[PDB]
Design a protein around this nucleic acid. Structure first.
Lengths: 102, 141, 167, 56
RNA sequence: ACUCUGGUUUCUCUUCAGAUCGCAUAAAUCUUUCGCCUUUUACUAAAGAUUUCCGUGGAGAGGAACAACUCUGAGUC
RNA sequence: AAGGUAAGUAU
């Protein structure tokens, strides 16, 4: 299908009635090129936080490549500091979840 | 070049319309300096010679005679009111306002047919009459 | 120069000219009509001065008609960009949290009252004390020390020449 | 809009639902009032409002 | 270390717009094409040119309010 | 929005 998609793409290159809302027939994002169709999300090496995307979900949705690399590169003291920071963060999260649905 | 008789005074137009006998008094309200009204006046002048026996045209100026502007809601150019037999006739030509022709006729023969139909309806005594050509569409295509 | 006036006389005027179907406010005539020419403009102000979620209440002054025919809000909605963005980000987080917590959400009725609801008298039920509670966050006192002193206000830091011009 | 704020102030429904109803009305005027007939161009505004709401 | 240096909040008034007037964004009319097309209200959608419209800055003027506290540079200091 | 007022007759 992709080969035929490129084929007809090159062929195309060279050779009242009120409406309630928008229609899907105007979408332009449909590109057969897998590189363009599947674009690597710019995670900024663990620093990419989209506005509307849930922070916890984004952390879960993060590829964790940067996180894993930082964990590997972190020294023993750095690992201890990170463990303490995440323990405090987990305690804070438990504190917030205690208030919710109490 | 707008040589048709014109009512200098408002009351003069009233008595001129009143002083009618077996004739149709086409009072064309508007202003001569308007271009569409100039075309309408030219069409009326062309018709006047051919149908002067029963159709009399008597123009008037809204500024000169503003008392009748509110009487029949005179707030558009090229308005024509076939005030015949001391009775405002109901000329229906496929338009919302079936008592006022407020645009210059495309052809003189159409206006002649309209005015003779108005004369026939007025003589018959009916206060309403229809047009052989509906103007709901302009036949643009 | 001219100054302000107490709202009591405005309330008296609107109560007197409650309805024009009687012979009360019929003498206004052209004066009354004049104001009508600029009726939509005031609506613009009422769509620009309308409160934000943090604004529990606001006391913006108005330009009213001497006959009470029309009232004009003489306020251009001014908010500094960073503080507005911070406030609406706090509201974003808070709305997301509330949606997470609330198991069933309720939307109100398309007509807020009956289709023949009379104009509610300000002194009757608008003067009710109960203001409910605006959507306000609980920021960390240590981190939000330069925040909670004036945050969640209609015109924060007003009359503080060290930070803004003032009026 | 004014009556919605009035009923909010006079107790009734909480402020979270007040904001939700404000959002809806702002993004559903086309459905609420149907400006389509009143003015064709307004359709553009309402349709884009749906688009922004779509993202919101 | 010495002399002069002298306000900022404001309210309006009258001008000029350079400056993304505005780190936002509407509408109206006209004009050429596109879907046109069933007459205007209208449209669809772009271009072109105006206008109103929300606003703003510069500059100047006149009162009120802090006008007495000076800020500050100059004054071989 | 509309392009969907029958006219007539004296009260």
């Amino acid at each position: 299908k992709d080969k035929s998609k490129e084929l007809h793409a090159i062929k195309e290159r060279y050779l009242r009635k009120f409406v309630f809302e928008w229609d899907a027939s105007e979408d332009t994002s449909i590109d057969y090129n897998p590189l363009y169709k599947e674009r690597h999300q710019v995670q900024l090496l663990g620093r990419g936080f989209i506005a509307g995307i849930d922070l916890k979900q984004q952390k879960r949705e993060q590829s964790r490549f940067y996180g894993d690399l930082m964990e590997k590169r972190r020294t023993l003291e750095e690992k201890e500091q990170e463990e303490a920071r995440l323990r405090k963060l987990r305690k804070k999260e438990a504190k917030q979840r205690w208030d919710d649905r109490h | 070049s707008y040589m048709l008789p014109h009512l200098h005074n408002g009351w003069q137009v009233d008595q001129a319309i009143l002083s009618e006998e077996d004739r149709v008094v086409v009072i064309r309200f508007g202003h001569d300096w308007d271009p569409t009204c100039m075309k309408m006046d030219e069409v009326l002048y062309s018709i006047a010679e051919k149908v002067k026996n029963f159709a009399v045209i008597y123009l008037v100026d809204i500024t000169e005679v503003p008392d009748f502007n509110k009487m029949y809601e005179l707030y558009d150019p090229c308005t024509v009111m076939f005030f015949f037999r001391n009775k405002h006739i109901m000329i229906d030509l496929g338009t919302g306002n079936n008592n006022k022709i407020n645009w210059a006729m495309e052809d003189k023969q159409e206006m002649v047919d309209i005015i003779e139909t108005v004369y026939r309806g007025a003589r018959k005594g009916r206060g309403l009459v229809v047009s052989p050509k509906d103007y709901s569409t302009k036949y643009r295509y | 120069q001219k100054e302000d006036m107490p709202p009591e006389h405005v309330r008296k005027i609107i109560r007197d000219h409650g309805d024009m179907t009687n012979r009360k406010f019929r003498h206004d005539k052209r004066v009354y009509l004049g104001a009508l020419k600029y009726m939509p403009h005031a609506v613009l102000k009422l769509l620009e001065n309308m409160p934000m979620p943090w604004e529990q209440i606001r006391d913006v002054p108005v330009l009213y008609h001497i006959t009470g025919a029309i009232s004009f809000v003489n306020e251009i909605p001014w908010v500094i960009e960073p503080v507005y963005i911070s406030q609406w980000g706090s509201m974003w987080i808070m709305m997301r949290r509330e949606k997470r917590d609330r198991r069933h959400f309720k939307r109100m009725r398309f007509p807020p009252f009956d289709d023949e609801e009379p104009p509610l008298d300000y002194a009757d039920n608008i003067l009710d004390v109960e203001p409910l509670e605006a959507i306000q966050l609980e920021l960390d006192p240590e981190e939000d020390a330069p925040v909670l002193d004036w945050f969640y206000d209609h015109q924060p830091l007003r009359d503080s020449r060290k930070y803004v011009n003032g009026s | 809009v004014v009556d919605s704020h009035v009923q909010y102030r006079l107790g009734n429904v909480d402020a979270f639902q007040l904001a939700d109803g404000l959002q809806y009305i702002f993004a559903h005027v086309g459905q609420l009032t149907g400006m389509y007939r009143y003015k064709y161009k307004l359709m553009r505004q309402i349709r884009m409002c749906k688009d922004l709401k779509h993202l919101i």
